Amino acid sequence: NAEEQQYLNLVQYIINHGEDRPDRTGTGTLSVFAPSPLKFSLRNKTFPLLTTKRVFIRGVIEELLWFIRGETDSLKLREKNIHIWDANGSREYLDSIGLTKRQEGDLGPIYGFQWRHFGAEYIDCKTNYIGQGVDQLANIIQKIRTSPYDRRLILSAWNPADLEKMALPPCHMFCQFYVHIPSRPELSCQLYQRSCDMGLGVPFNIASYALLTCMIAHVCDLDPGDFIHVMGDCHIYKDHIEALQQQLTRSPRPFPTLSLNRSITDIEDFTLDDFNIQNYHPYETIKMKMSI
Amino acid sequence: NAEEQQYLNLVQYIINHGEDRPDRTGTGTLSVFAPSPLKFSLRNKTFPLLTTKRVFIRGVIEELLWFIRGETDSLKLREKNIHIWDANGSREYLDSIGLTKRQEGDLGPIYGFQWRHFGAEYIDCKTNYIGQGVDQLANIIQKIRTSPYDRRLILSAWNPADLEKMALPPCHMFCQFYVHIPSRPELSCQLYQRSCDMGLGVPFNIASYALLTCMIAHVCDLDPGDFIHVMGDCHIYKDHIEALQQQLTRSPRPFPTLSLNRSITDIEDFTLDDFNIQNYHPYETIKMKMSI
Ligand SMILES: C#CCN(Cc1ccc2[nH]c(N)nc(=O)c2c1)c1ccc(C(=O)N[C@H](CCC(=O)O)C(=O)O)cc1
Ligand SMILES: O=c1ccn([C@H]2C[C@H](O)[C@@H](COP(=O)(O)O)O2)c(=O)[nH]1
Ligand SMILES: O=c1ccn([C@H]2C[C@H](O)[C@@H](COP(=O)(O)O)O2)c(=O)[nH]1
């Protein structure tokens, strides 16, 4: 796209200029710190769903809703045919990180929970946290309506006071919304990702947050502006270096568009069905492994 | 410089592509959201202390130590003759924001307190919080000491659960550290600043974090790498426009240098005299009016 390309070039930079870092998850990876952020116009309904490799947008949409509901149980993504949180939730893994009395499938006070109940005291993923902690999302929405120029529209998942309790620390830790009014519309979003996995990570989150912006934009009666991905520890797994170059030689197809609704009116009232993506023409999928 | 010059461009870019916006503090501005982050090298003892305008380095130093100590009382900073917090702590401001039962000078759970006592239950800037909350700064130094390639070296002041109790929401909300070991050194730092005042702010913060970075690198035996300033709502106050083209025309003098200590080894044991800044050759100073 020149959008997705800009991303590809980064997939090459981290390769021809990456850094050999011994990885804690125990794996060989190349990495670059704080490279130049990736921008994606969200205009004309365009949705930045990378074409150079089938992205699991089905899990993306499903996981975002899981986030907004403030749910922290992987079992719920399992009940919907999504196993992206099975590992960091395996009874085995919980133990490795000391969470032994924590029941399986309970990811701790991750993303969503912080999004809607920040300060709230976490205690089991099956409890109802209505009224507890601070609801960033609701606030963000409320503000954008009230006074849209606010410079404090911050959605975060990074709670240092609740880290150990988490099955995995907030990877994409927070984002700041901004709305430029014409000379009203243009809801932009710049998020900060501390650790970025270009192969499976970045793409998924690009779409993940592009929707977020679209959803919140939609509900606030705004147009999505652009989306800029800011990354810190950007990295690539060696066991994929080759499975990235063949991709790099691939020509990026134009991004599809996203059509929200049929007057869905709540944000907390979105369903897999209320999201419509048209003209997605990606290349042949590639089984992406990883590490933990 | 081209370091400072890059900054200068950004200042003109805002003037040319800036957006007329109603400022909350009250007075008019021009803002650009998500501009390309400024990088500054700390390589070879260089210190990004802008030269096209005298910078309150002393203000900068005293305030960092103040931060580190986890102090939240402006009065302290006043006993040292700094007045940068006298406003947002004035009796008149506190009430405008509702903290009508807050004794003047009590900024609340801001930067410092969050850095060393995050989870802690703040209450009165004269109380002893020793061992309360999460001591991010301490945990960061430590992880860097043990496992330096940690993708989780985050220091943040943004606590959604405390924002109201604060005299002002964190501006330079957070930063992640990263260390590139050779074939060890390089302690680079990337901070996200939701609201950047290219006028006074940014410059002051480039120094503020440039030092924090050096300082920590110092106690970890590492050498600094570079500094990356990422910014959200980057802007300018009209009442300083004409006041900028004048500066936009000055030729940036090369940055001075920073040599820390005499083996100060803790980050908790620093003082003005431990900071020697060789070769700071800025142009005369420019009186700029804030905006509460
Ligand atoms: C960064 C930061 C923290 N801050 C705090 C802080 C608090 C409220 C604000 N409010 C507004 N409207 N804009 C700001 O940028 C701002 C900054 C100077 C004062 C304060 C901060 C100054 O006066 N700096 C001197 C000039 C005056 C002097 O010599 O004393 C300088 O030259 O640096 C930064 C710089
Ligand atoms: O949305 C996500 C979630 C996880 N990760 C990756 C980043 C790192 O490779 C590892 C997390 O590292 P630490 O939690 O140890 O910091 O998982 C991503 O890239 N994107
Ligand atoms: O280091 C700093 C401290 C904050 N400010 C400014 C930014 C805004 O001018 C104001 C904060 O705007 P609010 O989001 O608080 O309204 O304080 C800076 O630019 N730099």
Swiss-Prot record, chains A, B:
Quaternary context: Homodimer.
Family stated for the protein in its record: Belongs to the thymidylate synthase family.
Keyword Transferase among UniProt keywords: yes
Domain of life: Eukaryota
Keywords, comma-separated and alphabetical: Methyltransferase, Nucleotide biosynthesis, Transferase
Gene: THYA
Designated name of the protein: Thymidylate synthase
Covalent S-S links between cysteines: none
A GO molecular function held by the record: phosphopantothenoylcysteine decarboxylase activity
Species assigned in the record: Pneumocystis carinii
A GO BP annotation: methylation
Residues holding (6R)-5,10-methylene-5,6,7,8-tetrahydrofolate: D197
